Design a protein around this ligand. Sequence first.
Ligand SMILES: Nc1ncnc2c1ncn2[C@@H]1O[C@H](COP(=O)(O)OP(=O)(O)OP(=O)(O)O)[C@@H](O)[C@H]1O
Ligand SMILES: Nc1ncnc2c1ncn2[C@@H]1O[C@H](COP(=O)(O)OP(=O)(O)OP(=O)(O)O)[C@@H](O)[C@H]1O
Ligand SMILES: Nc1ncnc2c1ncn2[C@@H]1O[C@H](COP(=O)(O)OP(=O)(O)OP(=O)(O)O)[C@@H](O)[C@H]1O
Lengths: 243, 248, 246
Amino acid sequence: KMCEVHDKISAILVCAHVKKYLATNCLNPGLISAIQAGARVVPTAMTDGTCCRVFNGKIQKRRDIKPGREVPEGWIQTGSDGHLIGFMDLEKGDKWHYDCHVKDPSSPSGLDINKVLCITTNKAGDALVYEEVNIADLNGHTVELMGPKFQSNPHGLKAHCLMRHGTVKLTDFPDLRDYVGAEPLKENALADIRNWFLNSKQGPHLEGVVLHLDNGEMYKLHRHHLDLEWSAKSARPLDQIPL
Amino acid sequence: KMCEVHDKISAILVCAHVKYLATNCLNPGLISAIQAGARVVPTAMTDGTCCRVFNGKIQKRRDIKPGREVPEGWIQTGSDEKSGHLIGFMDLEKGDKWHYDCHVKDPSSPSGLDINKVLCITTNKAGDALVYEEVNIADLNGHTVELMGPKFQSNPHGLKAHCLMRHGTVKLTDFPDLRDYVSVDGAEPLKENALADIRNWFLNSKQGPHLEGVVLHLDNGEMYKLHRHHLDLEWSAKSARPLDQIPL
Amino acid sequence: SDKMCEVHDKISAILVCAHKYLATNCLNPGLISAIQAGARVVPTAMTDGTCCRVFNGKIQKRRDIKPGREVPEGWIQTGSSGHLIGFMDLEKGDKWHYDCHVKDPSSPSGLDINKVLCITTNKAGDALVYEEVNIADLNGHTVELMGPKFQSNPHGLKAHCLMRHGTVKLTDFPDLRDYVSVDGAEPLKENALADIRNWFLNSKQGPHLEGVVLHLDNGEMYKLHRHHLDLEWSAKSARPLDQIPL
Ligand SMILES: Nc1ncnc2c1ncn2[C@@H]1O[C@H](COP(=O)(O)OP(=O)(O)OP(=O)(O)O)[C@@H](O)[C@H]1O
Ligand SMILES: Nc1ncnc2c1ncn2[C@@H]1O[C@H](COP(=O)(O)OP(=O)(O)OP(=O)(O)O)[C@@H](O)[C@H]1O
Ligand SMILES: Nc1ncnc2c1ncn2[C@@H]1O[C@H](COP(=O)(O)OP(=O)(O)OP(=O)(O)O)[C@@H](O)[C@H]1O
């Protein structure tokens, strides 16, 4: 039901890039066009790690190749930003990408190649949990690899794990349909969204928000667009997030 | 209704040099003020940089040694005795990127800042939690505030952004009523171990683990503080629970 | 005086480990044997600090003597790798060992050498509390000295503490008797390694704990570190110890 991360994701709001960000109240035109077309908008949680995917029972790390640079052996394109986006198989030196596999000291690889640790929604929809799942369950899906050795573990995760994008659906997130022949009801999307991250129950756990839509489109917003900080100190642990 | 930070704040308990450690003796001035009929309100001490909203601008504090030069616009507000320094405030300088950064960003401003709008952390409607809120800086005019966040003291409070807080906002609950340690009209005080009970509060209370210390705000305008270091406790992000989730 | 064990030796692993020493799904033979014998097994929390004890009325730091070095004056042997295990009086340089004492600016040392700050279970066993205690109350017992200057304070302690080993009893920890042959019959449960790992990840207490040490009725102890279960231990991967539910 959720979309796959195969190309760069536009921002929910129009944002100038100062080389900081200068966010505005103006929504992405594509989002307006889609909302008016009647697509459903599902806000999901943005987690901080390294983009990956499961592709035929193996993990593939995302790599963006910039103009004129060697395309690695095994790179498969999936979009084009102004660099090329795509995915490839792990190399020998990808120790921490392999570490999310469950261990097997009595194998030639030391790894159970068929099982990876995941953080996902429990049986209820009230809390996350760590679960050793069959890597095949994630075939064809983009995931976020997180843990100690990725981005300084801002989420406080206890072990390298994978999380299928869109897993965490946000509660009480501003309904962006309210900002879109009638005049919009609400008009301060930047403030209202910034307020959700500052003062909601889930915001303080999250790096941002990525909207998944029916048309397969996505629209993201990082804490930096909202003039907010993202770090371990400014983040509450992910495995404590309320769902 | 709370006091203004314009001078150095004395210690609730007489401290001893070793490092300054609090002892089990109340400050003579606090004894005198409590016997003179003064209300004492325990507030939360929070770790940032001392500022104030003078007129409609943020002003940063700057102390000066008497044998030095006064910067333009500097305004003296008090004077330390131990160090002999001059206590005062100042209009922000062009380099104070993170002092300015608590203003709300404004695409319609030639500087990208709404200079009449600041982010502040304050008590919510009910009074059971803190919330971040964009306010008109004029509401803080005339008051001293603690500027906090990522780039101030290494963000021990885990704040998600640079913000201001009015001094005295967080009123403490279950903090020892220091009148039970003062001789009432001539009689033995009711309680004896102010140091132990206050240290026990910081360690085991529900608010202590979130706080750098305590500041007493009295009707006299006087203030008396205690830092965690006076009580032989650590202050750091690892030893602090996030301020935004402090129980009130 | 207390019914918990004394850390005077090395502690074996609850599970047989491989090779980094990762635990496998097999129980330590000595543990299986002790269990079948009918020993009481009390799971307790493992906390990260440094091993000490309260002897006479003084804190003593544990030092392991390698077989090719000299024994320090005042070093008591208590155990047996090929190194001996013993305890010392604190040296003048152990600033942060002495820092768990209650300060006293009127005494020659700056410390009240008769009182130490410890972290223990409160009147009701529902939370942990910091408590200034007469050091003699701990005499003869081994403690974990923790705080800001020890392993980078992964537990987020607000001050250097002493905690009697075994103070924190674990809730909903796998009962390792259902994993041992009872009267020769098949054990009730087979996957100790999986059940234990899922506890450290998804239990209420696990995320606060470096590991688990079992305290047996016969003085034995058996342990598991987060590393034995392929898990991270660090301040970022650890919830504050003073907030652990009990
Ligand atoms: N639920 C989610 N939906 C989509 N992306 C998610 C989600 N959770 C985490 N992410 C991560 O967010 C990233 C979104 O950033 P984007 O695709 O624009 O590329 P980028 O290299 O991070 O770009 P930028 O430098 O502009 O931040 C995705 O690549 C993915 O790794
Ligand atoms: N609620 C509060 N009431 C008063 N001051 C507060 C409060 N919260 C934080 N503060 C800060 O506490 C500081 C009080 O400390 P003070 O000026 O006495 O010296 P100091 O920087 O702590 O140094 P020292 O310990 O050497 O005297 C003020 O700078 C003020 O910014
Ligand atoms: N509840 C507890 N019971 C026993 N020991 C505990 C407890 N909590 C913490 N500890 C610490 O665990 C240590 C037990 O581990 P041990 O001495 O065998 O080695 P280690 O430091 O864990 O390392 P290694 O795996 O290299 O042997 C004791 O020294 C003690 O300091």
